[PDB]
Amino acid sequence: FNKDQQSAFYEILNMPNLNEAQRNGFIQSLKDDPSQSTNVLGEAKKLNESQAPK
Amino acid sequence: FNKDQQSAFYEILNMPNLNEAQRNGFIQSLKDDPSQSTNVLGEAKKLNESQAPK
Amino acid sequence: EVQLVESGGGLVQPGGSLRLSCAASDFTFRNYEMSWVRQAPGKGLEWVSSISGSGGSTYYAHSLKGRFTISRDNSKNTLYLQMNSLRAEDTAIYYCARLRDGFNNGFDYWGQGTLVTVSS
Amino acid sequence: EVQLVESGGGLVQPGGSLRLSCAASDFTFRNYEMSWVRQAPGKGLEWVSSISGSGGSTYYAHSLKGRFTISRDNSKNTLYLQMNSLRAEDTAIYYCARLRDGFNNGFDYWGQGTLVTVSS
């Protein structure tokens, strides 16, 4: 329903450097409180970037 | 795009009688082909139903 | 010299999930429609799933509808099959096949196949 | 109903040798062509060796020609495969398979398989 919500949903669903537990965790957070979706996207990307190897 | 996809995702996250491998398996099925979202849920809810010791 | 190779598969207990991979080489692979077929002990070949050359059209059978899922990465020349809610009847040799001219002219190249055994 | 069982196999150090035996039952063993195939865990099947119904026609793969050897005793309903100069890549689960209607027409019954591990 919230347009801010689903775009972050597909953003986190397609994050490559997370593992399945972190993906499902941040996505479950998008369900519990749809007001914090933006913040949820920020801390997932931050983790996803720091967990990527070169 | 498909809202049925997102609703089946949150449907499967909260299934109690599944273990992490089965939960992530049906989620991977929702990732590969989002057209079968209804069918996967039917067979997921069925399996969860069979794994309850109630 | 067309060549396909299967990867993945092994022993899992009933109710589990697997994911099979097929690596093609020496052709375009995004122009041909692909298919997965399986062979149970004692029975003939049984058709399982298919995907179009571009993707966006996926075809499934009834013995496995709602449990299997097919996808392809045309940039890596790879084709995947995801198995869920596995049963004891699904134990078989799974083969990765290229269809020439769509569903109209049959198969022309196979893989070596991979074995899936489901027991306790 | 048809039943096949593999026997023999285990851990050996590199460069060593083993010998596998396959016991068939409940069908005419001298009319069907038999074969040995192997599969490492997580990867696909690889064809290894095959022999005709009577013997006197033997075919091997290219990775192991001159190292493995196939034979059959049609009076004991038994099929043997001996491995020599084993390497670390040869580790796999080995299966005993019956071909329907000759060589190029596929499989209809295999066995439970046995493990061959080569390490130090």
Author numbering:
A (entry chain B), B (entry chain H): 2803 to 2856
C (entry chain D), D (entry chain A): 1 to 120
How is this structure described in the published paper?
Derived from Staphylococcus aureus, Protein A is a 42 kDa surface protein consisting of five homologous immunoglobulin-binding domains (A–E) and an S region that functions as a signal sequence and cell wall-binding region (XM). It strongly interacts with the CH2-CH3 region within the Fc domain of IgG1, IgG2, and IgG4 and can also bind certain antibody fragments. Using this approach, we successfully reprogrammed multiple human-derived VHs and camelid-derived nanobodies to acquire high Protein A affinity, enabling efficient, tag-free purification via industry-standard Protein A affinity chromatography.
The sdAb n501 is a fully human sdAb we previously identified that targets the oncofetal antigen 5T425. It exhibits nanomolar affinity for Protein A and can be effectively purified using commercial Protein A resins, achieving higher purity and comparable yields to IMAC in a single step. Next, we co-crystallized n501 with the domain D of Protein A and successfully determined their complex structure at a resolution of 3.57 Å. IgGM accurately predicts the interaction between n501 and Protein A (DockQ = 0.834, RMSD = 1.29 Å), whereas AlphaFold-3 incorrectly docked Protein A to the CDR (DockQ = 0.028, RMSD = 13.11 Å). Analysis of the crystal structure reveals that the interaction between n501 and domain D of Protein A is predominantly mediated by FR1 and FR3. Specifically, FR1 and FR3 were found to interact with helices II and III of Protein A domain D. Further analysis indicated that 12 residues within n501 are involved in this interaction, including G16, S18, R20 from FR1, and T65, Y67, K72, G74, T77, S79, Q90, N92, and R95 from FR3 (IMGT numbering). The domain D of Protein A contributes an additional 12 residues to the binding interface, including A28, Q29, G32, F33, Q35, S36, D39 from helix II, N46, V47, E50 from helix III, and K53 from the interloop connecting the two helices. Seven hydrogen bonds are formed between n501 and Protein A (G16-Q29, S18-A28, R20-D39, T65-D40, Y67-D40, T77-S36, N92-G32/S36), along with two salt bridges (R20-D39 and R95-E50).
